[PDB]
Chain A
């Protein structure tokens, strides 16, 4: 007979599964894995006592009755949902053997669904404390969220247009005019704008719980992007308007509200996940969750016991260890089935293919970190009964030298961020010898990387710019990075950006340079929107967001990283062009294809029809494809510095009609029936269109449609 909270609650043996805290039978069951611990204790906090750094109650765990195998467990009977919990472990302290057991640390359960540290973004704890004590939320016996009948959209992947968004930066600027700027609820007000832009899927930058003050003591910078995860089961509480109210329930419900509101408007949600390392760093870092439970299990360790650095962040998660495998699969399944997330994007995904140290001949009877052809974790994810039918995207490289673009172990299921597409398009559009054939291959979905292995064109995620590196506007303004505001003496950041400043460096230039820059942004968007594969572009690229030449802006909570709703209205022409081009892609049945295009549908042209130029000096690619809706379309890219008049394919009984021309001044860069001057503007080019000709500026693009003429 044993009691815990002033004799009011009974303490029982409990069950070893499921891991974490679960509410049943008028109580909570606690279960946690620890192979190396010799003693364990459950610690409970009231919200007031957590602020004062005091444990309200301690329940020792008996090694006889409270331990099955390597799982410690206990049951408490009562009402505990207004309390927080943590663990205390005892054991060997030997950093040169990989053991970090210490009885004065209270660690957080890795399976906790909410972590309570601080309530407000950027504000430290009492005394300027940037790392106060953390504790986990204890669940309720029932659910408190109404999904209102939400059902999965299950869009085919070829129909997707992906919009990468930062949750806080989306509405943090004052010009958003939302009630709660920078929160999950604040972003709901702006989903109609995304719907009218033409996107149907949003990729969120890391929304797992992280410390934005993690290196605020040294230097003074924030951690804005959030690629340093503390708990994988929890949302970022300081992205919520409630804070720590109701012990994280309000934050969880706000995230669910955002997801439900996005699904109600026909928008899918893809989550960024960072499973390749942890905020605990190397041996000099803080002890929060994993190092205080099983360091040698959760991290990849060398013989002496120092941490491998394949992520370039301090440690490396031991992804292919069986316990870590179960943990990661459980986390992904939890997000899918409880938060209705439609898919995931994995950061530094090559780390998830490196081998575990358990297969060395010393342990059983090829060392740690050797890449594998069939990694068990990828096998478990691809063939999971639930996870096998969702969207899986891998960034197929890491910081340890691995580069697996086109050769990631896919099981014919996995998609990839195509960086070869990025490089080829960046080099071709700015004008460079020897990239016409690569450009034509990029336009077709890169069959040379995906067809042989049995994957489809839509497994390629095409992008020109991302959150890391230059924005679309800075791609045409700067020849080199300006990262001196980062405090690292311009050392950090990509050094080979493959950009061209269109003639002059900086935002102050002549009229012709600015005209050329606008042309080049339109050319980039046209190239993105007529390619086979899934197009993706970054938040604010649709109005020409600029970061001042800084191509690595991870440490600035500042308007350089905020969506400028005031500056968006000054650039309505580019936004209109992007919306119309996305609509055009949606309307054509020959643009997003389920299979690689054949030669009977797609024909390549040059300056003259039917004679493409694949020579090294060529800077001109043109094609025409048959469409079941529009009849036939014709696309041409002139990446040369010389204007040219091009001949159009001869189709007796028909004529070509102009639709897109990136050289023309707005709103005539895109022709719509809302324009009252459409017929007259078309008529003024009839003397060229009649004889199958079209004049092009340098660095321009055109799209034409075939229509009956009799």
Chain B
């Protein structure tokens, strides 16, 4: 294959160069046509060479031609030369430079970004850098530490706008590549690489892009579950901590990987979970943790059994296929607001060294030591959208939860944008129009996010942070029952135009206190957590503290699962996982699978399964696309009286729900729900029923397992029931027809 270069000269002319890979040397031919200003021949001097190669006529004086040859074993080099007439005058390029031509590499093409292979086997490299005035390509062999091949890029031939490109006939004998920008000899990682190497802290922070391409994956008959938003039950898990312990039963070096997660699908199936939310799986550094990613196109290599990138790709695809075969959606937490790089050369690995001005916010933000991405800059927009489309199309991912979502509306200067372009681009991307998108206000950074209305276009779901605060305060006898009424009905004050299905409710996440710690630890340093230790701090032997704690755990689960919205469960909250009162997400430990036979875990898992089955069975109430009609909800007090809405001493509320009648087609009963947060028992009255109808009790969290949930006593209408302290009750009306 031959390459051709046409140079305009400084005396209104053209010089034509051709470089041919002769069947192992190289031949360069120079042809100068036209004659207006110079007559008596030309000599090709190699940029000041004392010797010379005269140009001989080719086809009758129309053109002058010369030929040069070069021996093999020469690494890619450049040939530089000048032309001289029979006067001493020198002919240069139209940019006033010596004619420079590459020998051993092709010019390449600016698209696509990254590394690609053509049909003939040529390898194309392309990288964007506006600020760098010099770019070099390094090739490494199987070990490397020093480059086996170094190629400087010509600023004229190997550029199109602000994209540097180059082509190579073959990369045989090489396994990795990197880039060097400016004069700095520090190898950088390709932002668009699909397969990367090992993160090595040299004596520094370097990672190399791999020259191998991922093999074709056979998906088979895989189909997206496409579950409705109003039927979702979400389980949030950490890949490493989910199966790392010995008790999981997985074979070693496969525990704590994607295979370990795939091996436990029956756990989710028995719990009633139909969607799994994974904590971030982008490659990261152990110094800062998973919430500070380096790369956006690969899974972390430590999440695979073999520890390599291609192994991680195949393992992730296998896990996704296994989940889809079981009708379970896969959602991913994604960080796109900041990276793991630093404001110096020692912690530069990628985008910081290629083009700092475009990828990152200048000076960052006050009171922060992280590299804040310039999210709304068009190049970063393109990178983020490319990453999302890649994950959806290549890994068959069903949705995304954007960590630190409020940061995505900040502009280049840090100001708040009234029309943020990246969010709008994500919302109206035609490829992604069927994937779920959820905004999470929580931030791993030291600063805390301020609150403002998030633009949703009736498409974005949100993590409801007010739900946890209000439920925690109610169970602590510190909130008005109006807050509980608002949260039980789907949070209409925030999702009025969207619906209850867009509210993602939770009582505990991977940060803050866990479910067990929420009823066991309350110091003066845990005031931002709304916890109550039920009498004694830490583990206790008192028989009343234990009873109160068990009741409170049952109440928390019950209130979570009977509200309108999507319930989100955190890993370990179904089996008593505890972190000894710490609120750091880094202090959480591996899940213990040994205890899933005892009494407590059995009660918790059975109650969760019962609640999920009840939600499925009565979807006309719990799986709605629109809020319940105001004509079908009645709020009561102690004995069928008016509730005390503004009295901060009545921690008691009753809810009567009337079933609808659908004329499209069957009689479905009513629901009566009572919540008592008082430390004293309260008498409650059941509403009057129809003729020959009775109330059937389904849940009483003060009873004894088994029996406190049952799928049991019948109660006539207008009767009286004694609600114990810290107790929640549920009734369903059954017609004795």
Contact surface of A with B, Cβ cutoff 8 Å: 16-17, 33, 35, 68-71, 147-154, 264, 266, 321-323, 333, 337, 358-359, 363-365, 372, 376, 379-380, 383-390
Contact = CB atoms under 8 A, between A and B. Distances in A.
Contacts of A365: 453, 455-456, 497
B166 to A, nearest CB: 15
A322 to B, nearest CB: 5
30 contacts: A17-B393, A17-B431, A68-B393, A68-B434, A69-B431, A69-B432, A69-B434, A71-B430, A147-B4, A148-B4, A148-B6, A149-B5, A149-B18, A151-B7, A151-B157, A153-B94, A264-B6, A264-B14, A321-B428, A322-B428, A365-B456, A365-B497, A379-B378, A379-B421, A383-B378, A385-B128, A385-B130, A386-B161, A387-B161, A389-B161
Closest 9 CB pairs of A and B: A149-B4, A389-B161, A69-B433, A70-B430, A149-B6, A386-B161, A385-B128, A383-B378, A322-B428
A71 B8 contact: no
A390 B161 contact: yes
Contact of A153 (B8, B428, B429, B453): B8
Contacts of A379: 378, 421
Interface string B389-407: 1000100000000000000
Contact of B379 (A17, A321, A376, A385): A385
Contact of B431 (A35, A71, A363, A389): A71
Contacts of B12: 266
Nearest to A67: B434
A151 B162 contact: no
B431 A16 contact: yes
Given A70-B430, A323-B428, A337-B110, A386 B163 contact: yes
Interface in B8-28: 8, 12, 14, 16-18
Contacts of B94: 153, 266
A508 to B, nearest CB: 43
A386 B110 contact: yes
A80 to B, nearest CB: 19
Contacts of A147: 4
Contacts of A363: 457
A138 to B, nearest CB: 19
A358 B428 contact: yes
B378 A384 contact: yes
A70 B3 CA distance: 42
A380 B430 contact: no
Nearest to A385: B128
Interface string B376-393: 011100000000010001
Contacts of B431: 16-17, 68-71
Contacts of B377: 383
Contacts of B128: 385
A365 B358 CA distance: 31
Interface residues of B, number: 47
Interface in B415-468: 419, 421, 424-425, 428-435, 453, 455-457
Looking at A71, A151, A323, the one whose CB has the most chain B CB atoms below 10 A away is A151
Contact of B425 (A68, A152, A322): A322
A35 B459 CA distance: 15
B35 to A, nearest CB: 15
Contacts of A389: 161-162
B693 interface: no
B111 interface: yes
B156 A151 contact: yes
Contacts of B18: 149
Interface of B: 3-8, 12, 14, 16-18, 94-95, 109-111, 128, 130, 156-157, 160-163, 358, 377-379, 389, 393, 419, 421, 424-425, 428-435, 453, 455-457, 497
Contact of A359 (B7, B160, B419): B419
A365 B495 CA distance: 10
Looking at B12, B109, B433, B497, the one whose CB has the most chain A CB atoms below 10 A away is B433
A71 B430 CA distance: 6
A374 to B, nearest CB: 8
Looking at B130, B419, B497, the one whose CB has the most chain A CB atoms below 10 A away is B419
Contacts of B424: 322, 358-359, 376
A33 B430 contact: yes
Contacts of A376: 421, 424
A364 B6 contact: no
Given A383-B379, A389-B161, 18 more contacts: A17-B389, A69-B434, A70-B433, A147-B4, A149-B6, A149-B17, A149-B18, A266-B94, A322-B428, A337-B110, A337-B160, A358-B457, A359-B419, A365-B453, A383-B377, A384-B161, A385-B130, A385-B163
Contacts of A33: 430
Looking at B157, B377, B421, the one whose CB has the most chain A CB atoms below 10 A away is B421
Contacts of B428: 321-323, 358
A386 B164 CA distance: 10
A364 B457 contact: yes
Nearest to B497: A365
A333 B428 CA distance: 22
A577 to B, nearest CB: 22
Contacts of B434: 68-69
B176 to A, nearest CB: 24
A388 B130 contact: yes
Contact of A150 (B6, B433, B497): B6
Contacts of A358: 424, 428, 457
Nearest to A32: B430
A359 B424 CA distance: 9
Contacts of A372: 419
A359 B418 CA distance: 9
A69 B378 contact: no
A16 B7 CA distance: 40
A387 B382 CA distance: 14
Nearest to B107: A151
Contacts of A17: 389, 393, 431
Contact of A35 (B419, B430, B435): B430
A333 B378 CA distance: 15
A384 B377 CA distance: 10
A69 B157 contact: no
Nearest to B498: A365
A448 to B, nearest CB: 28
B163 to A, nearest CB: 5
Given A151-B5, A383-B379, A388 B433 contact: no
Looking at A35, A358, A364, the one whose CB has the most chain B CB atoms below 10 A away is A364
A266 B8 contact: yes
B456 A364 contact: yes
Nearest to A329: B378
A233 B723 CA distance: 74
A337 B163 CA distance: 12
Contacts of B435: 69
Looking at B379, B430, B457, the one whose CB has the most chain A CB atoms below 10 A away is B430
A388 B430 CA distance: 26
Contacts of B393: 16-17, 68
Contacts of B8: 153, 266
A71 B17 CA distance: 45
A386 B160 contact: yes
A72 to B, nearest CB: 10
A338 to B, nearest CB: 10
Nearest to B112: A18
Contacts of B419: 359, 372
A363 B424 CA distance: 12
Contacts of A386: 110, 160-163
A376 B432 CA distance: 20
Nearest to A363: B457
Contacts of A16: 393, 430-431
Contacts of A383: 358, 377-379
Contacts of B421: 376, 379
B6 A337 contact: no
Contacts of A150: 6
B164 to A, nearest CB: 10
